[PDB]
Symmetry: C4
Subunit: 424 residues, 4 copies
């Protein structure tokens, strides 16, 4: 009945999460399609594309510069002469207007740019100048001190008949591609990278599942308004217990009111702004759905056969909260250590991110024999700190490895005192 209304929320949450794991299957195949489109674009344009090579694509030489300039330039001339598909480079004037290239070959530079590195001085209007060449889809050179960056923006339509395999009509995706040499280091080494966007419009010559997603929205509303109303029972009850864990009899109701509302907001409203807001509101639903599993079990123990371990879940929070506080304080000072040493020879200690990632290496054994063995093997410097790397690392390995089991295990004996309470 009314717990029937709740479990109908739960299994309907199971079913709509079927619908979401379904929709995410559908998008995951489509993102297979997007990612396939992406990898295909990278190799094809890749005059010189190598795997991992992307990690190092840079002209050491100016001839190493201008030739690839010629190379892509030949790409832009004779792409229709060459392509394994059909690509459609229409006017697409960018990125400043006036008028169209299609390949707009631009280049940023200093504006005032006196730089005597032999003199250690400059007179730089740190202003930059940028110049572009228009190359009608059917040669110049520049100062090696002079440039700031350089780019080749052009766009090429293509149409999606592989969706004919997906039983769908050929649609339109235009690839807008800027090719940037980036001279921002100015250090004689210059990476190129290539960017593109894809306009997914339909084909010019141009829903029982969509209705299913909508009806699932309706039942989860039947759920979430049960949640406002059982919370209304609960808030009249808040008014009454004031006037006179578990944790989620109201709280899951608002939070699954939240999960249902976030699925609704991804569907139509923010879904006219599809891509990312989809991803985030789905962020919200999955907490609805993880929540769906947990409270289904919470409705579903039958005491668990009698609530002893459910009693076990609570009281260690009162001490292990202070415990987690102290252990985090340790984690912070050690992250401070990781920030400190990590610069001198490290990638692992490399950011607040990297200090967090070594925290993966602390409790997880993936980081251990690699980091302390390799940093023991000393890329490093300064053999006192060759001593110091092992000393901090083996120092940092030992204490937390000795201690975390006692955090949980002083727990494991004291909820054995709460199981001294409970095991009877």
């Amino acid at each position: 009945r009314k717990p029937c209304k709740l479990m109908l929320q739960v299994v309907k949450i199971l079913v709509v999460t079927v619908q979401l794991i379904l929709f995410g299957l559908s998008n995951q195949l489509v993102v297979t399609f997007r990612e396939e489109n992406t990898i295909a674009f990278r190799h094809l344009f890749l005059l010189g594309y190598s795997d991992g090579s992307d990690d190092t694509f840079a002209a050491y030489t100016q001839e190493q510069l201008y030739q690839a300039i010629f190379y892509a330039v030949d790409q832009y001339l004779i792409l229709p002469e060459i392509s394994l598909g059909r690509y459609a480079y229409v006017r697409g004037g960018g990125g400043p207007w006036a008028n169209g290239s299609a390949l707009a070959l631009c280049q940023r530079y200093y504006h005032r740019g006196h730089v005597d590195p032999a003199n250690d001085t400059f007179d730089i209007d740190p202003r930059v100048v940028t110049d572009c060449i228009q190359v009608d889809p059917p040669n110049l050179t520049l100062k090696f001190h002079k440039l700031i960056n350089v780019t080749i923006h052009f766009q090429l339509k293509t149409i999606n008949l592989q969706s004919l395999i997906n039983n769908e009509i050929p649609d339109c995706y235009t690839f807008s591609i800027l090719i940037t040499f980036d001279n921002k280091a100015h250090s004689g080494r210059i990476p190129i990278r290539l960017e593109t966007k894809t306009h997914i419009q339909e084909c010019k010559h141009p829903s029982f599942r969509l209705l299913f997603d909508v009806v699932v929205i309706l039942t989860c509303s039947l759920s979430f308004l049960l949640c406002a109303r059982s919370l209304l029972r609960g808030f009249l009850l808040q008014n009454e217990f004031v006037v006179f864990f578990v944790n989620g009899w109201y709280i899951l109701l608002v939070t699954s009111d939240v999960l249902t509302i976030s699925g609704t907001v991804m569907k139509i409203g923010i879904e006219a702004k599809n891509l990312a807001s989809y991803d985030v509101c789905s962020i919200l639903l999955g907490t609805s759905t993880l929540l769906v599993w947990v409270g289904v079990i919470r409705y579903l123990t039958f005491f668990h056969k009698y609530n002893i371990l459910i009693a076990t879940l609570r009281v260690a929070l009162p001490s292990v909260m202070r415990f987690c506080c102290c252990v985090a304080v340790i984690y912070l000072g050690y992250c401070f250590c990781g920030w400190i040493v990590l610069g001198p020879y490290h990638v692992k200690f490399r950011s607040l991110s990297m200090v967090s990632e070594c925290l993966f290496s602390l409790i997880n054994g993936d980081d251990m024999f690699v980091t302390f063995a390799a940093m023991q093997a000393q890329q490093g410097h300064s053999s006192l700190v060759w001593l110091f790397s092992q000393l901090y690392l083996y120092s940092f390995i030992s204490l937390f490895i000795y201690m975390v089991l006692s955090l949980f295990i002083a727990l494991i004996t004291g909820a054995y005192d709460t199981i001294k309470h409970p095991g009877g």
Copy 2:
């Protein structure tokens, strides 16, 4: 005697499992031979075969297409002129008949195939047309829009004198090889892959171990009919305990009746359908054999010196079953999370398989510093979700790592209450 009949089942199970680890040694060497034949075929035909390269073998260019067409075509002309062995390409007309090639060079295409990607439309009889060239073991071109796939089927016998090293006569293995270019993406990138089958017939010019396998079948029958009869004792006893763990005094008897029957069914009956049904019925025996080890120990404690830990095995099932239920519910919502985020930047969250594989990364430290460190390092997108990747990942690392020891360890204190029962 009768427990002598049972332990004779056990050691005879040990001995026949010797015979199976033996037979699997024999097949494992033979599968070394099959796998060696496989690797040899791959390199040899591999006009362009590279290690891992298989991961990317694709013509970006149409000249990249037709040349390899020429390349393998030259393979098919002059393979006898070239081979490091002797290969035998006889008539072998395939894969449609009429008549023989041997290299049957086929190519699938659209049938109705109007496709204006510049127009975003098509008129496709989504029909495909396929054309083949017959090249007698002793040049054409096609529309780059037009093809659907392409293949080169031919077969080449060879004979097995390396079994002369195995003290066996030279037998016959014909390699039937289709070379497929697959244009199913139609995305200007086109992978080739090569397939072959091997007919293992005997050489034209052409068993104490086999009898040993049969006699082992007979003794395990002496076992399994003891199992029907001690289960007959047991089912008369089921009739009596109705009329008036351990777990396996009957149950292993049917299951080892099962293990023995599965070994028997792999031997002759399904073994005239050898390869896979072999693998599966051996699937069944190994549970017989793992079972053989366990119940040998179960017959073999002598109480263990007194059944205390055997008493320890049972009662946590009554609570840790509900516990495993809840912990699995957590695993499912987190797998839901893994399905959700895993698409945006991931290989690890990549299927229900991939969500299962990250479940290896959860409890096993192989997945941790790699996944959360690398996804922290953000292939990714959208630095809010650059935040979100660490937040979900470090969120997902923390709780289960804190908690699973308490599942087993609330166990470790409550069968310390069942050892409060038992440790006296």
Copy 3:
């Protein structure tokens, strides 16, 4: 008040550690700049530079020698003709004087060097002779028995306008580079390596944050003199408790007097000797800062809500000290085993460092399936010791894996006896 003076030490320690994580952010970006300068130098000079290749750069041939000699020699002639920046090779006479090269091409050799390896004898004045060629920034050959080593020292200024991106003036960094062929093995294989130093002087044409670092020094002094004085309270109290854990009420005061003094000594005094003494005194501060987190928590439990786990921290030291002693004794004999076997086929057992690194592999699962699986897979020798590698390794895996949990877990029951004391 006075505990206000202490917590002001703590949060001011938090804030100055903000200032240090800040300053280390600043240096970490600058060391990004140094490391970027380093990687750029390596590739650019790298006539033949490959990734990892550095692991094997060696002329097998004498032509493999002298050509690269020509190659770098061409580098030294026409570097201004070639460079992607502007590099400044001024007089820079080195490394012996008289006068300048800039590329000083030197070569060490034996002095008395009779060596009949066909005779197994020598007449070596083990004296070495070294000869150098002066190549004005705008060919000879030597005995392959004869050389000891060879080098090409020259220096090239450059100026730092990328700091213009850091909003800083172009400064001066001179790269002094010796190119050494090292013939010390004399074994027909000869590695080259290239070294450089960088003089960071300012540009010729040429501080609210620095004042902030100084004022932080002042407040931490207000802290550390509170530490001398509360230790003065404490040492008058030492005089009184003599006359009549916690651990750090005095001890952190001297040690954070230490942390504050080490930050001060890195700032100005040893900071006129900047680089390394910076790194080490920062070594000292981070213990101040890890200490800052811990004693903030120690001041911050409010009993923790009542000091039970704080009581839990102590008494196991009285037994687990002897326990850690014994377990270390095990670790030493096994490290002795690692020293013993590790030579015959190993990199992992490779030093006292390498024996320590396998100690990472012992408790951490990063080293296990790799080492015992690969050394099981037997690079190795001598299949008795093919037996022995698995036998020692699987022997060495088993005992400590069985035992360390009982060290902590005989702990986990005996501070369950100290929690037999405490859990009431």
Copy 4:
């Protein structure tokens, strides 16, 4: 005194183990020298040597054969013309006599060798014929069906002046090198491998540390005869306790009598048969030395401050022995499973070795996300067994991961019942 005699054994064992870690340092540097000699030989002879490439060095073509034959043949002609050292190829007639080559170019073949693989038959005197060419250090072809194997044996002296860096005289090492093409597969793919031995004789023109090793032998004798005599005290005591743990008061005495005897037997007697018997008797000493650490601690607790955890070490053996028996029985049936499935798609399940190595993957997390994720990713076959690979693997991961902590942890509560005994 007499425990002084024992601790003098212990610290003298510490000191001689210093002497052994020393001697193993000396041999480890020398094995650095041997391994350096090895790597140098591999690259230098390596007409085509690549890293890892060794994993695949094989002629697919017969021209791929005979050319490398020419290549090494040119090696043998003009090695003195080419070498980065001086190499000494003297008469060295091998490997059959009569007389000398130096490069003895041999080739094994079938003797009777009729093989119609087109006929699936043969007439093989499985006899092999071998033919050799003598190439005086200053062209033929053979049947591609015909060969069995082929080899190029020659030897080249060289002399060790790098020991001049070790302050030692140039000695003599002759490298005897057979180059074998091995046609044993006969499968059209043919690997070459090259072997060499090195004769370490002294240079023709041609010990306080050795005396230190001898005197250490003498003191450990003073120890081991104390061991025979305190065991004589102990065996008179065996006679008395018959007439009327700890574990090692006698037992370490014989075993360290063993460790001392094994060091002695490696020194002189078997040490005139140096290399391997050195390695094995050192195998024996390290157990002496691990033993030296343990019994030093056993002599060294001072009760440990009171023998409670020493009491903790014993009684779980009485149950956990039966426990380890059962858990090993599980390990065997699962190793049986690993033998069973491991063939169909596996390297990890690859031998009894490989089944043991997956046992590293079971308890160690190095094997988990790789094996079950990659075998989940299905090299594999037969998607039922695509199901089966995850099912066995995730099946095999779960139980032992759930259970081993309870083995040690039913231990951790029952020596909490033995600490129910002991924690008072």
